[PDB]
């Protein structure tokens, strides 16, 4: 009449560690900043963002 | 004037293993959208079963 399928009671997720520690405190909190005409372009790469 | 009694083999298959496929498990399992998409196909699963 049917099939017997036991269902999973809950779901889990696994992922690798958040490595390389993406620098977001030096840009958002700096002692000195550039000018509106001479803004500095900062690129963040090779790191998983948080 | 002389006779020889010899025996020969002859193998014939009888029956194979009975198979029962789980239909909605094999198509796609653990999805409500799968049920909604398979219940609108009429009867393409009950006939196979």
H-helix or E-strand spanning residue B38: helix B32-38
* Elucidation technique: cryo-EM
Whole-angstrom distance, CA of residue B2 vs CA of residue B30: 75
* Residues of A contacting chain B (CB within 8 angstroms): 3, 5, 7
Closest CA to A27 of A15, A16, A39: A39
Which two three-digit tokens encode residue A10? Answer: 């809950």
Residues A32/A39, Cβ–Cβ less than 8 Å:
no
Residues B49/B22, Cβ–Cβ less than 8 Å:
no
Closest CA to A48 of A14, A26, A15: A15
Whole-angstrom distance, CA of residue B37 vs CA of residue B31: 10
Which two three-digit tokens encode residue A31? Answer: 């002692």
Mutation for B interface: A1, A3, A10, most B CBs within 10 A: A3
Residues B38/B45, Cβ–Cβ less than 8 Å:
yes
Category of B27 on φ-ψ map: left (φ > 0), alpha (ψ -120 to 50) or beta: alpha
Whole-angstrom distance, CA of residue B49 vs CA of residue B47: 5
């Amino acid at each position: 009449t049917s099939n017997f399928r036991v269902q999973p009671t809950e779901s889990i997720v696994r992922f690798p560690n958040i490595t390389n520690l993406c620098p977001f405190d030096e840009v958002f909190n700096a002692t000195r900043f550039a000018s509106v005409y001479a803004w500095n372009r900062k690129r963040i790469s090779n790191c998983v963002a948080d | 004037t002389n006779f020889t009694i010899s025996v020969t083999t002859e193998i014939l298959p009888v029956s194979m293993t009975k198979t029962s496929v789980d239909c909605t498990m094999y198509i796609c399992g653990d999805s409500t959208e799968c049920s909604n998409l398979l219940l609108q196909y009429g009867s393409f699963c009950t006939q196979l079963k």
